[PDB]
């Protein structure tokens, strides 16, 4: 299968990215430095780790894949790759497998050393609950990163130059992390006569960074809808990315 033959490239090209390894080291140090100041000084410190991975795992995913489609078009390899025995689906889904296993390893260096810094600095942490509360944490941090991978494939296929792809990847990172929730707070403190505040626990479902925190803070909806809505953010935006990639 050629979905893996182009995925082994993106592991080998992604692990030699100097920009990723700087941030993934800074992600792994800050995941220890939050866990150091949450144990010596478990839901109180796993929530501060959720605010860290809402900052950096969208940023790690957008650093990997902002030049996935348009970076190959400027490099000229994209027009070459379509003349190979390869569909446009297998290039995109193979990049999603290749970039997906990178940040599925960046949480194993990120939270694999953070959960070690909790199991050896609490002295009585009751590790049967730890490896399930971090199992729900490492899985849901990959799924948050896989959304922004599919968000990066949407903005790469639309633009025609690599410089304007980073101008949209910065715009998607600003909008989906800390502009969508600031206009949720602005709909509260500035509008009260026509804004029902009961609607706002449902309005977090239009934001994959918000659905990421709700399954680390455990709510009118149950947990199982939020897992099926986080996977739905992957499946619509990957289908949206394939529809954009078929119009180059």
């Amino acid at each position: 299968n050629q979905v893996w033959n182009i995925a082994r490239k993106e592991l080998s090209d992604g692990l030699r990215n100097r920009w990723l390894l700087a941030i993934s080291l800074l992600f792994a140090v800050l995941a220890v430095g939050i866990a150091w100041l949450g144990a010596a000084a478990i839901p109180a410190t796993i929530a501060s780790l959720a605010s860290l991975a809402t900052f950096l795992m969208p940023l790690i995913a957008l650093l990997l894949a902002y030049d996935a489609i348009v970076g190959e078009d400027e490099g000229g390899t994209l027009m070459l790759l379509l003349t190979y025995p390869l569909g446009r689906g297998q290039i995109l889904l193979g990049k999603f497998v290749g970039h997906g296993l990178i940040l599925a390893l960046a949480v194993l260096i990120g939270f694999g050393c953070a959960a070690l810094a909790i199991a050896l600095l609490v002295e009585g942490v009751e590790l049967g609950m730890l490896f399930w509360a971090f199992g729900r944490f490492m899985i849901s941090s990959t799924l948050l990163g896989w959304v922004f991978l599919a968000f990066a494939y949407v903005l790469s296929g639309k633009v025609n130059e690599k410089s304007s792809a980073a101008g949209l990847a910065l715009g998607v990172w600003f909008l989906f992390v800390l502009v969508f929730d600031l206009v949720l707070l602005a709909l509260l403190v500035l509008s009260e006569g026509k804004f029902n505040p009961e609607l706002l626990p449902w309005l977090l479902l239009l934001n994959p960074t918000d659905i990421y925190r709700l399954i680390n803070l455990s709510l009118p909806v149950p947990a199982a809808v939020l897992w099926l809505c986080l996977l739905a953010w992957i499946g619509v935006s990957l289908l949206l990315a394939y529809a954009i990639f078929r119009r180059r």
């Binding site: 050629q2 033959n5 182009i6 082994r8 490239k9 080998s12 090209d13 030699r16 990215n17 490099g75 000229g76 390899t77 027009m79 070459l80 790759l81 379509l82 003349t83 190979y84 025995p85 390869l86």
Partner: protein, 299 residues
């Protein structure tokens, strides 16, 4: 069993018909050279051989098939212009990666690395490559597997003439094996020794297709009869004015005649017998002035 049978395509985008009634027919072993502008004359027809586009009001037939069948592109090399590969990857690793996609054997990557001459620079990063070093890398993926049709879009840009003459030696090895290739070049002098049939096309239509003897017979261009030391310059200037040929007053005892090449057989008979000469050179009209004439023939 023609490799490329372009049968009456009319390619268009909006109101602009970017390719008007092109009809190519590439043989099973010919080396055909597409020459034109950088714009949509050449680069749309080159994309039409590949499955990147679709014939808007015609059809193309690569190897007797449609160009988007996956069995075609398992035996269809391609090297594009100005390609920079993945710079964090390696030289051997990139060709190992492109061998996995084309269905080629992984044992074939070691001969192809040294055939193009990249064994000194394999297992090094692609960012520390030259422009000419990447062109040998991009050539080596076009020979992956056993290709039956190549498209070498500008293979000689930024290459030393040792490696350029080495490249055409690889071409003449390839076309004798039974692999008809396609050149899409801008640099014309040097390529005419190995082009089996030129395919100069301007912006609108397909201008001229034929062999090099087939163009110069049709397109009437002057041959270059340049001599030196016959007896003297003016002592044999008389024969060209009597037979009606434009002759030039060259340096010293030396005769340049830009003849009309109809009499140039019988112009060379009585010239050669009494002629001493130290150093002559008879130049036929090249690919360049043929391209210069066919550009002015269409706008």
């Amino acid at each position: 069993m023609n490799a490329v049978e372009i049968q009456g395509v009319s390619q268009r985008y909006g109101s602009m018909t970017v390719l008007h009634d092109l009809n190519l027919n590439l043989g099973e072993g010919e080396v055909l050279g597409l020459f034109g502008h950088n714009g949509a004359g050449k680069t749309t027809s080159m994309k039409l051989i590949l499955g990147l586009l679709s014939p808007s009001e015609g059809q193309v037939k690569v190897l007797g098939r449609a160009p988007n069948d996956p069995q075609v592109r398992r035996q269809l090399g391609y090297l594009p212009e100005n390609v920079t590969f993945y710079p964090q990857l390696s030289g051997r690793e990139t060709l190992r990666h492109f061998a996995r996609l084309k269905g080629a054997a992984l044992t074939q990557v070691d001969e192809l690395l040294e055939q193009v001459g990249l064994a000194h620079a394999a297992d090094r990063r692609v960012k520390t490559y030259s422009k000419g070093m990447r062109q040998r890398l991009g050539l080596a993926q076009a020979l992956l597997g056993e290709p039956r049709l190549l498209l070498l879009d500008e293979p000689t840009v930024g290459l030393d003439p040792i490696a350029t003459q080495d490249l055409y030696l690889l071409i003449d090895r390839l076309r004798q094996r039974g692999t008809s290739i396609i050149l899409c070049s801008h640099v014309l002098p040097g390529v005419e020794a190995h082009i089996n049939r030129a395919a100069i096309l301007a912006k609108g239509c397909l201008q001229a297709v034929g062999s090099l003897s087939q163009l110069r017979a049709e397109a009437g261009l002057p041959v270059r009869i340049r001599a030196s030391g016959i007896s003297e310059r003016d002592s044999w200037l008389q024969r060209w004015t009597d037979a009606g040929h434009s002759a030039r007053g060259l340096s010293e005892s030396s005769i340049e005649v830009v003849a009309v090449n109809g009499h140039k057989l019988v112009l060379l008979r009585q010239l050669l017998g009494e002629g001493e000469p130290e150093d002559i050179e008879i130049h036929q009209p090249s690919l360049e002035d043929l391209y210069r004439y066919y550009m002015e023939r269409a706008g």
